[PDB]
Curated annotation (Swiss-Prot):
GO BP annotations, alphabetical order: cell wall macromolecule catabolic process; defense response to bacterium; defense response to Gram-negative bacterium; defense response to Gram-positive bacterium; killing of cells of another organism
Function: Lysozymes have primarily a bacteriolytic function; those in tissues and body fluids are associated with the monocyte-macrophage system and enhance the activity of immunoagents. Has bacteriolytic activity against M.luteus.
Stretches assigned to the C-type lysozyme domain: 1-129
Sites where the protein binds substrate: 101
Protein's name in the database: Lysozyme C
Lineage: Eukaryota, Metazoa, Chordata, Craniata, Vertebrata
Family: Belongs to the glycosyl hydrolase 22 family.
Predominant location: secreted
Gene that produces this protein: LYZ
Amino acid sequence: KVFGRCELAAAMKRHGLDNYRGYSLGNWVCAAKFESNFNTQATNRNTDGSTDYGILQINSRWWCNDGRTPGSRNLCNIPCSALLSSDITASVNCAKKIVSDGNGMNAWVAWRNRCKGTDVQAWIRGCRL
Ligand SMILES: [Cl-]
Ligand SMILES: [Cl-]
Ligand SMILES: [Cl-]
Ligand SMILES: [Cl-]
Ligand code: NA
Ligand SMILES: [Ru+3]
């Protein structure tokens, strides 16, 4: 599914991400924009052989199992394919664990490089939330 900006904001809110670990909804929307362009089916191979999956480009090296990432973990206890679903529940639940891991949203390099410190509230501007 390719979400609209306010559609995804609404879904993330409904799923408990608004201010999760102190990160306003705009931060989550901004991260999703630059990780996946709001596309739940987004996949990208990393140089290390791992693959990132979904709306929030969660990595197969720690967080989900894809059967092809040697020496990896599956800390979210899910198949990476669950992260490509139109239903964002699995991605949100796993992102909750990632952002709680110690470095907050810096775990998402594109959040750090493109969202951090910016006017992230722009991302939820005009949404009925
Ligand atoms: Cl915000
Ligand atoms: Cl699996
Ligand atoms: Cl959903
Ligand atoms: Cl933090
Ligand atoms: Na894995
Ligand atoms: Ru839902």
